[PDB]
Amino acid sequence: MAAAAELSLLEKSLGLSKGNKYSAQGERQIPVLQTNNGPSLMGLTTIAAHLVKQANKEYLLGSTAEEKAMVQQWLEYRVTQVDNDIHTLLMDLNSYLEDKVYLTGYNFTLADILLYYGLHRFIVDLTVQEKEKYLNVSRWFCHIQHYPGIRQHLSSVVFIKNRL
């Protein structure tokens, strides 16, 4: 039931008090939200973008047409690529992140939150040497894990920072 719990997490990180109920749909257990407006909404990234707008935090979806397309890109990556396989994923992500603090390039967006929640599973299990192998992933993940209100109940992963 992981996706419903993850959308519950995001509700809390977005500072939304009214916890929604989610069902599942299909052999792949895709999340479903009935809304009060009220069209019914299905899929992690579709619901998450809905939740952002009602938290009055639409900047998390990006601020220019280019940043929006980048947020869209990284949302699609979460549901298609994240959701031994992971070591190949992590290496490519490590290279991508070498020159960036945030996933979409410049600013903190929903794409960082959802990728952080999606990888958390795998990052908790990396050895010390593996965290040192993927330095850029570790650096980004540590920054999001400390970012105000995001981690909530997730375990902190231990990252030791040089000369600190």
PDB file of C-alpha atoms in Angstrom:
ATOM      1  CA  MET A   1       0.000   0.000   0.000  1.00  0.00           C
ATOM      2  CA  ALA A   2       3.089   2.231  -0.404  1.00  0.00           C
ATOM      3  CA  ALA A   3       1.730   4.937  -2.740  1.00  0.00           C
ATOM      4  CA  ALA A   4      -1.190   5.944  -0.476  1.00  0.00           C
ATOM      5  CA  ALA A   5       1.175   6.276   2.482  1.00  0.00           C
ATOM      6  CA  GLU A   6       3.545   8.306   0.328  1.00  0.00           C
ATOM      7  CA  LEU A   7       0.771  10.729  -0.661  1.00  0.00           C
ATOM      8  CA  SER A   8      -0.059  10.934   3.089  1.00  0.00           C
ATOM      9  CA  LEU A   9       3.580  11.888   3.692  1.00  0.00           C
ATOM     10  CA  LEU A  10       3.400  14.589   0.982  1.00  0.00           C
ATOM     11  CA  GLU A  11       0.177  16.010   2.418  1.00  0.00           C
ATOM     12  CA  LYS A  12       2.083  16.530   5.702  1.00  0.00           C
ATOM     13  CA  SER A  13       5.231  17.977   4.064  1.00  0.00           C
ATOM     14  CA  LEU A  14       2.952  20.435   2.192  1.00  0.00           C
ATOM     15  CA  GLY A  15       1.234  21.511   5.428  1.00  0.00           C
ATOM     16  CA  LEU A  16      -2.246  20.172   4.548  1.00  0.00           C
ATOM     17  CA  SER A  17      -4.278  19.220   7.638  1.00  0.00           C
ATOM     18  CA  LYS A  18      -7.149  17.269   6.017  1.00  0.00           C
ATOM     19  CA  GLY A  19      -5.793  13.751   5.353  1.00  0.00           C
ATOM     20  CA  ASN A  20      -7.387  12.219   2.236  1.00  0.00           C
ATOM     21  CA  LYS A  21      -8.265   8.565   1.842  1.00  0.00           C
ATOM     22  CA  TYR A  22      -6.765   6.660  -1.135  1.00  0.00           C
ATOM     23  CA  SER A  23      -7.785   3.383  -2.718  1.00  0.00           C
ATOM     24  CA  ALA A  24      -5.874   1.235  -5.152  1.00  0.00           C
ATOM     25  CA  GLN A  25      -6.634   0.298  -8.757  1.00  0.00           C
ATOM     26  CA  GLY A  26      -5.227  -2.492 -10.963  1.00  0.00           C
ATOM     27  CA  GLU A  27      -2.682  -5.296 -10.567  1.00  0.00           C
ATOM     28  CA  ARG A  28      -0.072  -2.555  -9.937  1.00  0.00           C
ATOM     29  CA  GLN A  29      -1.989  -0.948  -6.988  1.00  0.00           C
ATOM     30  CA  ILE A  30      -2.151   2.624  -8.441  1.00  0.00           C
ATOM     31  CA  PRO A  31      -3.482   5.301  -6.021  1.00  0.00           C
ATOM     32  CA  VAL A  32      -6.895   6.921  -6.373  1.00  0.00           C
ATOM     33  CA  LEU A  33      -8.262  10.112  -4.870  1.00  0.00           C
ATOM     34  CA  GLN A  34     -11.897  11.177  -4.965  1.00  0.00           C
ATOM     35  CA  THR A  35     -11.986  15.003  -4.739  1.00  0.00           C
ATOM     36  CA  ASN A  36     -14.835  17.270  -3.421  1.00  0.00           C
ATOM     37  CA  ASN A  37     -14.971  19.516  -6.571  1.00  0.00           C
ATOM     38  CA  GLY A  38     -15.005  16.784  -7.622  1.00  0.00           C
ATOM     39  CA  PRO A  39     -13.346  14.828 -10.505  1.00  0.00           C
ATOM     40  CA  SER A  40     -11.728  11.549  -9.442  1.00  0.00           C
ATOM     41  CA  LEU A  41      -7.880  11.406  -9.726  1.00  0.00           C
ATOM     42  CA  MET A  42      -5.533   8.505 -10.309  1.00  0.00           C
ATOM     43  CA  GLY A  43      -1.712   8.108 -10.270  1.00  0.00           C
ATOM     44  CA  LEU A  44       0.990   9.291  -7.867  1.00  0.00           C
ATOM     45  CA  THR A  45       2.193  12.198  -9.950  1.00  0.00           C
ATOM     46  CA  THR A  46      -1.280  13.346 -11.003  1.00  0.00           C
ATOM     47  CA  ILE A  47      -2.494  13.395  -7.380  1.00  0.00           C
ATOM     48  CA  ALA A  48       0.766  14.956  -6.089  1.00  0.00           C
ATOM     49  CA  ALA A  49       0.402  17.883  -8.532  1.00  0.00           C
ATOM     50  CA  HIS A  50      -3.195  18.293  -7.482  1.00  0.00           C
ATOM     51  CA  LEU A  51      -2.080  18.401  -3.773  1.00  0.00           C
ATOM     52  CA  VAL A  52       0.569  21.068  -4.527  1.00  0.00           C
ATOM     53  CA  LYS A  53      -2.028  23.461  -6.049  1.00  0.00           C
ATOM     54  CA  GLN A  54      -4.414  23.119  -3.090  1.00  0.00           C
ATOM     55  CA  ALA A  55      -1.483  23.803  -0.694  1.00  0.00           C
ATOM     56  CA  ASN A  56      -1.149  27.067  -2.656  1.00  0.00           C
ATOM     57  CA  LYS A  57       2.460  26.056  -3.503  1.00  0.00           C
ATOM     58  CA  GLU A  58       2.257  25.887  -7.331  1.00  0.00           C
ATOM     59  CA  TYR A  59       5.878  27.152  -7.635  1.00  0.00           C
ATOM     60  CA  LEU A  60       6.823  23.518  -6.777  1.00  0.00           C
ATOM     61  CA  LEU A  61       5.645  22.582 -10.289  1.00  0.00           C
ATOM     62  CA  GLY A  62       8.142  25.015 -11.797  1.00  0.00           C
ATOM     63  CA  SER A  63       8.158  28.718 -12.669  1.00  0.00           C
ATOM     64  CA  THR A  64       9.043  28.943 -16.379  1.00  0.00           C
ATOM     65  CA  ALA A  65       7.868  26.746 -19.283  1.00  0.00           C
ATOM     66  CA  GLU A  66      11.357  25.153 -19.246  1.00  0.00           C
ATOM     67  CA  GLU A  67      11.272  24.463 -15.482  1.00  0.00           C
ATOM     68  CA  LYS A  68       7.756  22.999 -15.759  1.00  0.00           C
ATOM     69  CA  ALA A  69       8.940  20.640 -18.490  1.00  0.00           C
ATOM     70  CA  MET A  70      11.902  19.688 -16.218  1.00  0.00           C
ATOM     71  CA  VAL A  71       9.550  19.016 -13.292  1.00  0.00           C
ATOM     72  CA  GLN A  72       7.335  16.918 -15.635  1.00  0.00           C
ATOM     73  CA  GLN A  73      10.390  14.993 -16.839  1.00  0.00           C
ATOM     74  CA  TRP A  74      11.525  14.103 -13.286  1.00  0.00           C
ATOM     75  CA  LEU A  75       7.957  13.168 -12.173  1.00  0.00           C
ATOM     76  CA  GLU A  76       7.798  10.741 -15.140  1.00  0.00           C
ATOM     77  CA  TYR A  77      11.230   9.368 -14.162  1.00  0.00           C
ATOM     78  CA  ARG A  78       9.955   8.636 -10.621  1.00  0.00           C
ATOM     79  CA  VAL A  79       7.007   6.528 -11.838  1.00  0.00           C
ATOM     80  CA  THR A  80       8.744   4.818 -14.766  1.00  0.00           C
ATOM     81  CA  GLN A  81      12.335   4.288 -13.623  1.00  0.00           C
ATOM     82  CA  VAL A  82      12.255   4.196  -9.836  1.00  0.00           C
ATOM     83  CA  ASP A  83       8.842   2.604  -9.289  1.00  0.00           C
ATOM     84  CA  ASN A  84      21.183  -4.304  -8.795  1.00  0.00           C
ATOM     85  CA  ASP A  85      18.763  -2.411 -11.060  1.00  0.00           C
ATOM     86  CA  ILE A  86      19.187   0.513  -8.690  1.00  0.00           C
ATOM     87  CA  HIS A  87      22.991   0.647  -8.858  1.00  0.00           C
ATOM     88  CA  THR A  88      22.822   1.374 -12.581  1.00  0.00           C
ATOM     89  CA  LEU A  89      20.104   3.990 -11.874  1.00  0.00           C
ATOM     90  CA  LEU A  90      22.208   5.570  -9.047  1.00  0.00           C
ATOM     91  CA  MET A  91      25.352   5.830 -11.165  1.00  0.00           C
ATOM     92  CA  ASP A  92      23.522   7.737 -13.927  1.00  0.00           C
ATOM     93  CA  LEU A  93      21.771   9.952 -11.372  1.00  0.00           C
ATOM     94  CA  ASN A  94      25.165  10.553  -9.660  1.00  0.00           C
ATOM     95  CA  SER A  95      26.551  11.959 -12.952  1.00  0.00           C
ATOM     96  CA  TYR A  96      23.463  14.039 -13.639  1.00  0.00           C
ATOM     97  CA  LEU A  97      23.660  15.634 -10.155  1.00  0.00           C
ATOM     98  CA  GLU A  98      27.428  16.515 -10.318  1.00  0.00           C
ATOM     99  CA  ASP A  99      26.709  20.140 -11.252  1.00  0.00           C
ATOM    100  CA  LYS A 100      23.315  20.742  -9.575  1.00  0.00           C
ATOM    101  CA  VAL A 101      21.966  21.235  -6.043  1.00  0.00           C
ATOM    102  CA  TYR A 102      18.335  20.502  -7.124  1.00  0.00           C
ATOM    103  CA  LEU A 103      16.959  17.927  -9.549  1.00  0.00           C
ATOM    104  CA  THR A 104      15.518  20.338 -12.040  1.00  0.00           C
ATOM    105  CA  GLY A 105      18.661  22.460 -12.026  1.00  0.00           C
ATOM    106  CA  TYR A 106      18.261  25.660 -10.018  1.00  0.00           C
ATOM    107  CA  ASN A 107      15.316  25.561  -7.623  1.00  0.00           C
ATOM    108  CA  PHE A 108      13.672  23.131  -5.186  1.00  0.00           C
ATOM    109  CA  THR A 109      10.571  21.577  -6.773  1.00  0.00           C
ATOM    110  CA  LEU A 110       8.121  18.687  -6.305  1.00  0.00           C
ATOM    111  CA  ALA A 111      10.468  16.561  -8.369  1.00  0.00           C
ATOM    112  CA  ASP A 112      13.061  16.607  -5.519  1.00  0.00           C
ATOM    113  CA  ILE A 113      10.406  15.587  -2.934  1.00  0.00           C
ATOM    114  CA  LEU A 114       9.040  12.678  -4.896  1.00  0.00           C
ATOM    115  CA  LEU A 115      12.410  11.361  -5.925  1.00  0.00           C
ATOM    116  CA  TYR A 116      13.622  11.651  -2.301  1.00  0.00           C
ATOM    117  CA  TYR A 117      10.527   9.642  -1.089  1.00  0.00           C
ATOM    118  CA  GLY A 118      11.017   7.094  -3.917  1.00  0.00           C
ATOM    119  CA  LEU A 119      14.692   6.406  -3.374  1.00  0.00           C
ATOM    120  CA  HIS A 120      14.557   6.541   0.394  1.00  0.00           C
ATOM    121  CA  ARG A 121      13.956   2.746   0.320  1.00  0.00           C
ATOM    122  CA  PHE A 122      17.227   2.128  -1.487  1.00  0.00           C
ATOM    123  CA  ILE A 123      19.365   4.829   0.085  1.00  0.00           C
ATOM    124  CA  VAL A 124      18.693   3.525   3.660  1.00  0.00           C
ATOM    125  CA  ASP A 125      20.308   0.254   2.619  1.00  0.00           C
ATOM    126  CA  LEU A 126      23.564   1.519   0.994  1.00  0.00           C
ATOM    127  CA  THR A 127      26.854   0.673   2.638  1.00  0.00           C
ATOM    128  CA  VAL A 128      29.277   3.436   3.616  1.00  0.00           C
ATOM    129  CA  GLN A 129      31.397   2.729   0.611  1.00  0.00           C
ATOM    130  CA  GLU A 130      28.304   2.882  -1.686  1.00  0.00           C
ATOM    131  CA  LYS A 131      27.284   6.267  -0.237  1.00  0.00           C
ATOM    132  CA  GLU A 132      30.862   7.442  -0.949  1.00  0.00           C
ATOM    133  CA  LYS A 133      30.690   5.983  -4.507  1.00  0.00           C
ATOM    134  CA  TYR A 134      27.601   8.069  -5.301  1.00  0.00           C
ATOM    135  CA  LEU A 135      28.740  11.306  -3.722  1.00  0.00           C
ATOM    136  CA  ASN A 136      26.413  13.577  -5.640  1.00  0.00           C
ATOM    137  CA  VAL A 137      23.382  11.419  -4.890  1.00  0.00           C
ATOM    138  CA  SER A 138      24.368  11.316  -1.189  1.00  0.00           C
ATOM    139  CA  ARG A 139      24.908  15.094  -1.134  1.00  0.00           C
ATOM    140  CA  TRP A 140      21.536  15.832  -2.778  1.00  0.00           C
ATOM    141  CA  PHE A 141      19.670  13.256  -0.676  1.00  0.00           C
ATOM    142  CA  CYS A 142      21.169  14.678   2.579  1.00  0.00           C
ATOM    143  CA  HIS A 143      20.110  18.207   1.502  1.00  0.00           C
ATOM    144  CA  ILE A 144      16.501  17.113   0.796  1.00  0.00           C
ATOM    145  CA  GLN A 145      16.315  15.021   3.984  1.00  0.00           C
ATOM    146  CA  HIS A 146      17.165  18.172   5.989  1.00  0.00           C
ATOM    147  CA  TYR A 147      14.941  20.491   3.912  1.00  0.00           C
ATOM    148  CA  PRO A 148      12.224  22.068   6.135  1.00  0.00           C
ATOM    149  CA  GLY A 149       9.248  19.755   6.686  1.00  0.00           C
ATOM    150  CA  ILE A 150      10.075  17.098   4.103  1.00  0.00           C
ATOM    151  CA  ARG A 151      11.418  14.111   5.973  1.00  0.00           C
ATOM    152  CA  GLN A 152       8.610  13.894   8.612  1.00  0.00           C
ATOM    153  CA  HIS A 153       8.702  10.273   9.847  1.00  0.00           C
ATOM    154  CA  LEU A 154      11.283   8.824   7.448  1.00  0.00           C
ATOM    155  CA  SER A 155      14.537   7.634   8.977  1.00  0.00           C
ATOM    156  CA  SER A 156      17.539   9.925   8.569  1.00  0.00           C
ATOM    157  CA  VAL A 157      20.326   8.378   6.609  1.00  0.00           C
ATOM    158  CA  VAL A 158      23.745   8.951   8.127  1.00  0.00           C
ATOM    159  CA  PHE A 159      26.006  10.998   5.917  1.00  0.00           C
ATOM    160  CA  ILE A 160      29.294  12.223   7.382  1.00  0.00           C
ATOM    161  CA  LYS A 161      30.506  15.487   5.865  1.00  0.00           C
ATOM    162  CA  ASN A 162      34.300  16.116   5.488  1.00  0.00           C
ATOM    163  CA  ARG A 163      36.064  18.009   8.224  1.00  0.00           C
ATOM    164  CA  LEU A 164      32.930  18.498  10.384  1.00  0.00           C
TER     165      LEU A 164
END
